[PDB]
Every structure is written in structure tokens, then in C-alpha cells.
Design a protein around this ligand. Structure first.
Ligand SMILES: C[C@H](CCC(=O)O)[C@H]1CC[C@H]2[C@@H]3CC[C@@H]4C[C@H](O)CC[C@]4(C)[C@H]3C[C@H](O)[C@]12C
Ligand SMILES: C[C@H](CCC(=O)O)[C@H]1CC[C@H]2[C@@H]3CC[C@@H]4C[C@H](O)CC[C@]4(C)[C@H]3C[C@H](O)[C@]12C
Length: 159
């Protein structure tokens, strides 16, 4: 079955620029700015569109070694990006997949809001509780603030 967890968080970066830097070029940018959270991102197959597979590796000592993401949909107009965690780490006999959706919306102050939905597809009577998905949110937040810090400091990047 499916457990749906939704959150929002704010960014000080405008939606289009954040979408281009953090989501689209996130494969280059995230390991450079947050190497203590993400050790590398390997493109396995594809050019970034639906069906593209990436292997996200975590630093030594983390609970999980890696996950593989599959890009599902990329909407450049509405700054929506949908991807699934389909292998690795927690994926196995208790968790089949995680289907994720990020949408970035402009705020009139020149920042953005990130709307996130994470759907945990389980196998068995295995439960996913808000407490534990908190680590997903903490990760996301750390990555976001690392990207924002970079973008604030490198004004000519991703315009
Ligand atoms: C795999 C987790 C957890 C999501 C969940 O619990 O469902 C998510 C949380 C934040 C995600 C990252 C956001 C920044 C990057 C976005 C890129 O387009 C793909 C690589 C990165 C580095 C992502 C890798 C991976 O997709 C992460 C680490
Ligand atoms: C808490 C859920 C659900 C696990 C389950 O079904 O039992 C699991 C599923 C995906 C997991 C994430 C995968 C990517 C990351 C791996 C890191 O090495 C630890 C932090 C992250 C951000 C993990 C946090 C947490 O461990 C999650 C969100």
C-alpha cells in the first residue's frame, strides 16, 4: 500500500533559478556543495528526461550506501519534477518504491516555496511513520540550504 507524506519549505531563491540549479543541475551541484550529505551522483542511463536513472551515493557511516532514482516527469513550465527511488538502501522486501514530487512556486518577495509529496509503496504489513520520514525532510532541507548558500555567493550561476 501507499503512505503519503507532504511538506513545504521556503527558499530565498527565485523559483526558475532554484529549479535550474537544485533540481535540474542537482547532479553536479549537490555533491559539490553538500559533500558531507551526498558523496556522488552517477548518471547510469539517460540524459535527464523521464526514464533517466541516477545512483545517489551517501558518505561513509550513513544508514544507507546508495539509492537509485528514476526520473518520472520534468515540467519546465510549472517547475515540477517527479522521480522515484527504485533500488538500493531501504528498497527491498519491505519497501518497493518511493514516488516523489517536487513543485517550486514563486512568492512575491522574490523567493519560492517547495511543495513536496513523498509516497512510500510498501510490501507486507510494514508501516512508515512520520518520525522516520523526518530524516528525508532533514536531508532535503540540508541540501536546499547548501544550494541556496552557493547561489547567493555565485550571482552569475544558473541565470
Ligand atoms: C532519496 C532522498 C529521500 C526522498 C524520500 O524519502 O522519498 C532524496 C531527498 C533529497 C534528494 C536530493 C535533492 C537534491 C538532488 C536533486 C537531483 O535531481 C537528484 C540528486 C539530489 C542530490 C537528490 C537525491 C535524492 O533524490 C534525495 C537525497
Ligand atoms: C524512513 C523511510 C522509510 C523506510 C521504511 O520503509 O522502513 C526511509 C526510506 C528512504 C530513506 C532515505 C533514503 C535516502 C537517505 C539515505 C541516507 O543513508 C539516510 C538519509 C536518507 C534521507 C533516508 C532517510 C530514511 O531512512 C528514509 C526516508
Amino acid at each position: 500500500g501507499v503512505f503519503n507524506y507532504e511538506t513545504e519549505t521556503t527558499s530565498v531563491i527565485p523559483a526558475a533559478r532554484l529549479f535550474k540549479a537544485f533540481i535540474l543541475d542537482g547532479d553536479n551541484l549537490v555533491p559539490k556543495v553538500a559533500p558531507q550529505a551526498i558523496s556522488s551522483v552517477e548518471n547510469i542511463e539517460g540524459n535527464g528526461g523521464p526514464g533517466t536513472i541516477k545512483k545517489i551515493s551517501f558518505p561513509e557511516g550513513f544508514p544507507f550506501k546508495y539509492v537509485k532514482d528514476r526520473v518520472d516527469e520534468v515540467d519546465h513550465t510549472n517547475f515540477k519534477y517527479n522521480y522515484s527511488v527504485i533500488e538500493g538502501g531501504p528498497i527491498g522486501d519491505t519497501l518497493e518504491k518511493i514516488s516523489n514530487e517536487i513543485k517550486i512556486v514563486a512568492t512575491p518577495d522574490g523567493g519560492s516555496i517547495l511543495k513536496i509529496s513523498n509516497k512510500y509503496h510498501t510490501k507486507g504489513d510494514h508501516e512508515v511513520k512520520a518520525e522516520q520520514v523526518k530524516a528525508s525532510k532533514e536531508m532535503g532541507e540540508t541540501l536546499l540550504r547548501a544550494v541556496e548558500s552557493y547561489l547567493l555567493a555565485h550571482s552569475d550561476a544558473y541565470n
